[model samples]
Target: CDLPQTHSLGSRRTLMLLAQMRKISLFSCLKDRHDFGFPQEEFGNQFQKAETIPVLHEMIQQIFNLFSTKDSSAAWDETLLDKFYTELYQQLNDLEACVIQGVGVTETPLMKEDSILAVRKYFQRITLYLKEKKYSPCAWEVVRAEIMRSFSLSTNLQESLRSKE
Candidate 1:
């Protein structure tokens, strides 16, 4: 027989779990050095049309910084913010392709399973929010959800992995 349900997590626990997932996410670990292995100047130089990759990278960095800040509640302009998400999706897509080519040949996984899960959750929230409303899309609400998803996936993965050990 299944155990009785003692407590309902509700939204708060869900958010907490996402936060813990983000805390253990491997995004920072494999960022610059692993997978594609650092941003080479030649990668940008390969294009003559004034490397938008670097610009996109800067835009994503700004988005990450803005989203991670405590007082990020003040900046909720969806019109302007949408550009960052668009560019970020493109950037990650390109990076994913590169990783598949470079590290996919090896047996080792490029990212921790939890990291991918977190990223997928974050991206889904962002995508859903963008698709729902046009102008004022409850920007902060979506941002909070995205961040929580990333965090919780990472934290939950850690606990799950630890338990097996």
Candidate 2:
């Protein structure tokens, strides 16, 4: 029912920035050396053009998981999380349609459980880190920066797919 590129794929990252702005600035933790165990590149160890679709699926799913965990922890503003959740839900559904509509050039089951499992394990570390740190300002900011970095990676990957097809 929903129709817009910005609605699904675009706005998730934008909402992330909005949520960041909603918080008070403590310090620039992005400059710090704390690695949140995010994957090296391509948001789950890179992929061929075809696998971008499924990897995108995994990326969005993990981001949604991260957001929901943060919300449930009451670590940030409830209102912001509410809106973010709405965006992700739409994105998830829309992504399903996008995949369904496409046939070739991006295979369906040419999949690798290891890389997908890589992302799964990494996000597990992320959520645990959040809870271990008790979801402090430092924890949130660091996680946000890591996520934003991943956002750029996924965004670039998606744009490439957009132009390739």
Candidate 3:
């Protein structure tokens, strides 16, 4: 069951950003978190990875493909989506943060653009998936893959950075 609550300023900002990207997952999750008194800082957790970038990309993509479904105009319970989004956002945010930290702005222009795009795309998927479905474990999986994919792309960006230097 969903609880009644006011929207957070940050959640609203995040929703707007998600809206611009055509994603509703983040907004939906943010709304749930706000109603349930859940903390948004959970979105800032860190994740460690040791696999090769190519392998990681495949693994993440596989997960996303497995979890994605085509359901139009379907509404899911916010509580369930909130639960999923909290963890999903944490993983995605951490991955993006890692890329941003690893790929400094002083790096090559192309690599920088690619790295930024990778992170942005990851978030875009989150917004899109959330808007499409309210509670799918597969959606969670897909969001995770998107984050990991961005991380892998960031790794490639770093490699390019090394080559040009």
Candidate 4:
């Protein structure tokens, strides 16, 4: 008899999002170093050839910290912020493309189609919110929750799959 090894389709999709976010974070960090005028030699040595996930995670936390500490009432440059958001949106789209290509190569019936659709819907919502110029801590928090949900689900699935084997 078949056992209960079924997993949420959203889990894998979420994992894909996390992977893309890691990529985005890494690229953002590299751009930051250059933008901030960090020494080319040191930056090269520090980040050019190394394990990147940890560095990306640190960069993500640093970004969250900076945003959290930013003064609300301070005068803001709309153009700069617009440019930043646009770049972020583009990065997300690129990540989505990567995910799609990856899924094509490893298509599995273990994942539910609806769950994948749900994840994509969430991504669309996120993109829409960003396009609407709605940048806020709360917005980031919601996205974070989505990321965690997918991550937790994926972990459970992995455990389930292992037990069944």
Candidate 5:
């Protein structure tokens, strides 16, 4: 069942595999260009305008910086991170779009420090933490899970927006 040896070597077959790999390689190209192809439709949540807008905006950059650090280490897994970040970056775009679509809302940061602190500084310390951890599989695992949780909550918020809007 090895991929190279399996059944077809047809261009479409090879094309399909390559196309699939294209995402991985696309990931590579992104790094080479120092780009983070923020997804476009293709791509949100509080008064979404308010808490959601800023928070999501902050997270987009926060996540970008964290993943960009992956470029620095090179010790991390290329295959999965490429695919996962591709999907995540796209999702955040979509998620942000979803929130903004019902844009009548976007309100007050009355709780700026507390809400800001939630996303703002954690990313600061976490980078060094992973660096200290040497960005191992276990380290990636922990961080991945944590970020996914953040993704979920943000999604949870988006879904709520969908429900209300």
Candidate 6:
């Protein structure tokens, strides 16, 4: 989804920054899968075949520098945050699409419930975290860790299934 342009300059800038942050986060997750040594074909060769992991990694670090600066301000517009939430929801939809299309080879494990549902649960929690307005590097890490754990488990399960096959 595109950013809304009707907002003020500050609001627009905040939304754009949030959008970039989410993009980097998604890219980082994909790169983590490849870094774990999972076979390219298992992930539908998305990251490996595209040769974007290193670039994504670099971008994430670069963006982090902007937000982590000593001169960075903490003031955020509520409307901008709401817009960011909407954008994050769309990102979750894209993730769901990836799961459904089987574009990636690895499948999240069916852990006593639907694997996709489990992933969505984490997304929901992340959305709630975003709404809490308690943004911090540590808070984001907690959510990121949860996301990575779920994906890591899924990848491991898929590898196990492949071995059995």
Of the candidates shown, which would achieve the greatest lDDT relative to the real structure?
2
Write model 4 residue lDDT over 17-94, tens digit each, in one string.
443442223332332222112222322212211122222223223333322333211213334434433443444344
Return the top candidate by TM-score: 2
What TM-score number comes out for model 4? 0.30
Q: Note each model's CA RMSD in angstroms.
A: 17.8, 5.2, 16.2, 18.0, 14.3, 14.8
Ten-residue stretch with the least lDDT total in model 3: 1-10
The better-scoring model by TM-score among 4 and 5 is: 5
lDDT of 5 by residue, 1-165 (tens): 001111122223323432343222223222223222222112222332445555665666566666655552364456755654565476566655655555544445666555565556545555655667676444444454444444444444334322222
TM-score, every prediction: 0.27, 0.65, 0.27, 0.30, 0.48, 0.30
- Clash pairs, candidate 3, are 23-127, 23-128, 24-127, 25-130, 67-138
Question: Which 10 successive residues of model 1 have the least lDDT summed?
Answer: 1-10
C-alpha positional error of residue 35 in candidate 1 after TM-score superposition, expressed in Å: 32
Model 2 lDDT at residue 130 = 68
lDDT assessment of candidate 3: 0.35
Model 4, global lDDT: 0.34
Winner by lDDT between candidate 4 and candidate 3: 3
The candidate 4 region of ten consecutive residues with least summed lDDT is 44-53
Candidate 2 residues 20-109, lDDT tens each? 645646374645326656555535433354555555566667778777664543766777677776676778667645764554444544
Candidate rank order under TM-score: 2, 5, 6, 4, 1, 3
Q: Deviation in angstroms for 112 in model 3?
A: 10
Q: Any residue pairs clashing in model 4, and if so which?
A: none
Which parts of model 4 are misplaced by more than 4 Å? 1-116, 130-133, 161-165
List, in order, the clash count of every candidate structure: 11, 0, 5, 0, 6, 3
Error of 5 at 140 (Å): 1.9
Candidate 1 wrongly placed segments (more than 4 Å): 1-98, 103-125, 135-137, 159-165
Clash pairs, candidate 2, are none
